[PDB]
């Protein structure tokens, strides 16, 4: 377990833990999911929490979040659901993630970064050189380190 992996868990946790109190509530979970275009009910959010709420206090703490990531990621992402994620980034749905669209989802999520950092990410994934990220490029980027 590296400090960078820990830093990554922390970053992810803090995208949900908006008030920084060390627990993720239904309110906070819902906030993230709404920003990504979904509309779960309060009861549905509670059911999500209950799956990993090992201490039974009704909210997600750091290790319970790690468990959620352990399970609910590397399920076995199929074609269709990878396309769903792409669609989140391709805001206008023209088939090409622009730097501006990438910036927008990241900001909506709660990430804070300069247009410089966004451009860097784009250029990293832009295999064919048009300054944008298409579906194939997006899929390929996720296989790299």
């Amino acid at each position: 377990l590296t400090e960078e992996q820990i830093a990554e868990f922390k970053e992810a946790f803090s995208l949900f833990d908006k008030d920084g109190d060390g627990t993720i509530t239904t309110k906070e979970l819902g906030t993230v999911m709404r920003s990504l275009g979904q509309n779960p009910t309060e009861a549905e959010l509670q059911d999500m929490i209950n799956e990993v709420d090992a201490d039974g206090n009704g909210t997600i703490d750091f290790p319970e979040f790690l468990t959620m990531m352990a399970r609910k990621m590397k399920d076995t992402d199929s074609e269709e659901e990878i396309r769903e994620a792409f669609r989140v980034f391709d805001k206008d749905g023209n088939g090409y993630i622009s730097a501006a669209e990438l910036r927008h989802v990241m900001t909506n999520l709660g990430e804070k970064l300069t247009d410089e950092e966004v451009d860097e990410m784009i250029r990293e994934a832009d295999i064919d050189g048009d300054g944008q990220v298409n579906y194939e490029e997006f899929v390929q980027m996720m296989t790299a380190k």
């Binding site: 990554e8 992810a12 999911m33 990531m69 994620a85």
Partner: peptide, 19 residues
Amino acid sequence: RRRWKLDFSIVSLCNHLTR
């Protein structure tokens, strides 16, 4: 680090949670 992979991960998680 893996900025896009981390964010992708969060988007894929959220998609997975709305089962």
